[PDB]
């Protein structure tokens with residue numbers, strides 16, 4: 761039956777992006793990747809089957825898919841080709857995704873706000889906010 765995470769389930773499309781190029785600079789993304797990545801208007805498809813949550817991104821830049829169980833670390837190859845160790849947890853009603861690689865860490869938090877799914881990507885002191893609405 762229903763879980764709280766079902767608030768995230770569905771098909772979402774990106775409607776606005778603030779400071780993403782600066783976030784990607786902090787992450788260490790190189791120029792050509794930043795330019796083509798920052799142009800993309802991905803769809804994000806989130807589904808839940810038992811204990812497994814799947815988040816897919818479809819765009820003209822890259823399609824990616826992760827499946828995971830909350831609190832259980834997994835390997836992830838990111839859209840910019842970092843190989844990272846990821847763990848995703850739910851804190852209150854916020855999905856918090858921490859990615860670790862090469863001594864560095866970045867946190868992506870996803871939360872519902874009104875009819876939007878707001879994604880906050882933080883690398884040290886730089887925050888990018890990416891807003892999606894239902895497709």
Ligand SMILES: COc1cnccc1-c1c(-c2ccccc2)n(CCC(=O)O)c2ccc(C3CC3)cc12
Nearest residue numbers: 797800802803804816817819821822839840879890
């Ligand atoms: C341009 O962003 C994307 C384009 N196509 C597919 C996935 C993503 C992409 C995504 C993404 C998009 C939809 C669903 C799940 C994840 N994230 C997570 C943050 C975000 O929502 O933009 C990201 C965080 C950082 C980067 C930069 C490092 C390269 C790219 C992405």
